[PDB]
Amino acid sequence: QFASVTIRNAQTGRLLDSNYNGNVYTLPANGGNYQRWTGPGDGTVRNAQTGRCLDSNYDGAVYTLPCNGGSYQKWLFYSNGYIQNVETGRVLDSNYNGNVYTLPANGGNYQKWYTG
Numbered sequence: 001q002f003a004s005v006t007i008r009n010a011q012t013g014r015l016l017d018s019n020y021n022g023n024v025y026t027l028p029a030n031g032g033n034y035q036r037w038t039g040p041g042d043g044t045v046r047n048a049q050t051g052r053c054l055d056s057n058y059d060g061a062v063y064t065l066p067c068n069g070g071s072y073q074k075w076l077f078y079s080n081g082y083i084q085n086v087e088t089g090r091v092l093d094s095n096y097n098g099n100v101y102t103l104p105a106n107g108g109n110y111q112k113w114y115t116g
């Protein structure tokens, strides 16, 4: 479990962030609570500001939605930095533009995250 941690992309250095409309992206660190995330212990990754759950689909889109208990909202954190969706098996990824998505694991640094 974790409370109010940042989730930083190892490659870009940008932080996972989201808004009340459910958009997810990365931005440079700004100290705000939209850039913090909380993991209760049920596999969810909840935005500390909005309370919405990180979610994704088989096409690789990522977004936040009200927490609904489903497997698309459950994530596995690996000690090597992967963040894997339980339903799809795809891992969280992002780019220098700030887009966030999921892709099959390919060992790249864009799929490594530092959570703390």
Ligand code: NA
Pocket: 005, 006, 007, 008, 015, 016, 017, 035, 036, 037
């Ligand atoms: Na973050």
Ligand code: NA
Pocket: 043, 044, 045, 046, 053, 054, 055, 073, 074, 075
């Ligand atoms: Na979640």
Ligand code: NA
Pocket: 081, 082, 083, 084, 091, 092, 093, 111, 112, 113
């Ligand atoms: Na990942």
